[PDB]
Amino acid sequence: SFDCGKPQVEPKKCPGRVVGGCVAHPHSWPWQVSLRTRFGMHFCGGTLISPEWVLTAAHCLEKSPRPSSYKVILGAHQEVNLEPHVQEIEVSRLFLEPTRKDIALLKLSSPAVITDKVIPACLPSPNYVVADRTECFITGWGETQGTFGAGLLKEAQLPVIENKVCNRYEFLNGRVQSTELCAGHLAGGTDSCQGDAGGPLVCFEKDKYILQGVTSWGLGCARPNKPGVYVRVSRFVTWIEGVMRNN
């Protein structure tokens, strides 16, 4: 009986001013997935959106078409030395977005056991445009530019920047389309690609966290004066629903 987007461990909620991010409270981002190689090395992030489905970036599956080449780790906080309670589930089927966007679906060969440390994130209604300045969080392990909290799950607070403004000449110069969204700072931002490719970007709504973006470094990484661009989940909801409904 675990409804999506409601962690059992309340998130640290790293201050926006902390552009370098914070180590997350363990298990406060219950849907955080870690995509792993055949041998067991984390290499990408993803989000649990149902017990049998994980939403990640197409870029993460570029090395192999075989589902058997991927296994997902759920309930983790450590990147290498996982806790014994961590769930490891092999991937049964892969589904890349039909129009070459950096988003893909992985079907778990076995349903995820929903626990207090493993809960699915909620999905936005089709074509919903998250409001300007909404507070969101990107989470993942990725490349820790520091070394403090290295190997552990981290988070960063990023406010959304409406496409109209993000596309201004001094910033993204009109390169951000409807299938994308910007979250971050226009000035005084960190210089680094945050999270894990395929990692989630969730924004709190009424009483739950909604997955509104997927991490894609190709779209653009945070820069001192440039916000990072994310794949807008809402434009692929109808597509995600179909695959889940036919597989």
Swiss-Prot record:
Bridged cysteine pairs (disulfide): C4-C122, C14-C22, C44-C60, C136-C203, C166-C182, C193-C221
Site (Cleavage): R17, V18
Annotated Peptidase S1 domain residues: 18-245
Reported impact of S28P: In PLGD; risk factor for thrombosis
Domain of life of the native organism: Eukaryota
Modified residue annotations for Phosphoserine: S34, S125
Positions of the catalytic residues: H59 (charge relay system), D102 (charge relay system), A197 (charge relay system)
Effect of A57T: In PLGD; type 2 plasminogen deficiency; decreased activity; Nagoya-2/Tochigi/Kagoshima; risk factor for thrombosis
Designated name of the protein: Plasmin light chain B
Species annotation: Homo sapiens (Human)
Full-sequence range covered: 564 to 810 of 810
